[PDB]
A paper describes a structure:
The structure of rat CrrY domains 1–4 has been determined in two distinct crystal forms and reveals a 70° bend between domains 3 and 4. In both crystal forms rat CrrY1–4 retains the same overall conformation and secondary-structure elements, which can be taken to be representative of its solution structure. Small changes at the CCP1–CCP2 and CCP3–CCP4 interdomain junctions induced by the different crystal environments in the two crystal forms cause the two models to superpose with an overall r.m.s.d. on Cα atoms of 1.3 Å over 239 residues. The structural agreement within the individual CCP modules is closer, with r.m.s.d.s on Cα atoms of 0.53, 0.12, 0.29 and 0.60 Å for CCP1, CCP2, CCP3 and CCP4, respectively, over the ∼60 residues of each CCP domain between the two crystal forms. The rat CrrY1–4 CCP3–CCP4 interdomain interface, where the hockey-stick handle meets the blade, buries ∼300 Å2 and is centred on specific contacts between hydrophobic patches on CCP3 (residues 162–167) and CCP4 (residues 228–234 and 278–279), forming a kink in the structure. The overall arrangement of CrrY1–4 is very similar to those observed in the crystal structures of other two factor I (fI) cofactors, fH1–4 and CD461–4. The fH1–4 cofactor, as seen in the crystal structure of the C3b–fH1–4 complex, overlays with CrrY1–4 particularly well in the first three domains, which are predicted to form the bulk of the contacts with fI (28% sequence identity, r.m.s.d. on Cα atoms of 1.6 Å over 180 residues). Thus, a kink at the interface between domains CCP3 and CCP4 in CrrY1–4, fH1–4 and CD461–4 is likely to be a shared feature of all fI cofactors. The major differences between the free (CrrY1–4, CD461–4) and C3b-bound (fH1–4) regulators localize at the CCP1–CCP2 and CCP3–CCP4 interfaces, which appear to be remodelled in forming the regulatory complex, bringing domains CCP1 and CCP4 closer to C3b. The change in orientation of CCP4 with respect to CCP2 and CCP3 is particularly striking when comparing the bound and unbound regulators, with CCP4 rotated more than 70° away from C3b in both the unbound structures (overlaid ) compared with the bound fH.
Residue numbers in the entry: 37 to 290
The structure:
Amino acid sequence: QCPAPPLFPYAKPINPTDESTFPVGTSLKYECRPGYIKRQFSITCEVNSVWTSPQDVCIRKQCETPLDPQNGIVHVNTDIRFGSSITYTCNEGYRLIGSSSAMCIISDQSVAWDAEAPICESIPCEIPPSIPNGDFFSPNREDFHYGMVVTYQCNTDARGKKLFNLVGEPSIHCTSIDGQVGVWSGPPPQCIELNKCTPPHVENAVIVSKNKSLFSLRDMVEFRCQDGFMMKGDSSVYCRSLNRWEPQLPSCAA
């Protein structure tokens, strides 16, 4: 009263023969297919004319233990057996080279990852910017990677004495915004002559006096707060030594 056995995706019959009718109590010899741990078993035709195979008879074969790449991680979403997949990511300051994923597939008479694990390499940087009248200090002057810091310094005169004022942040570091290209954290500083002041900025104010690309000692700057802003400090300031202003730069508060 049993029909022909089911067509199992995980198993095949050891000795298939031409037939389509089996009485209850009939046992047939089956085998696990490629990608499953080798096992020979029996399927039985039960009293209700339905075929029953033993529970968890065919176990999917395991692929090699994945490792986390150095400076990266391996992500096991299900397991490390036949048909499953793994993905890889690199850590902050590193970029992936190779395959970001692998699948556990049939390889010859066993199973294997259809891709090799990737490399997570340090994000490189271009040489930091050149600045007129100064330079940066580095043990390696032409090799930069994520995290590295460079400090700039102004050139001295022919007698080794201070000749310029270093204006702005003296240090910058190799970073990345996209996790692929290395960028310097900010702009390099400027090396300004000792009798000069760089153009002053006061938020929510305009200069009403003559603007200059660069000011000289005792040059005056007059500021005006924008509409609806209140002034704190004197509106007229003069260029001092060390890129300073006397009185100090004013402020505009809403």
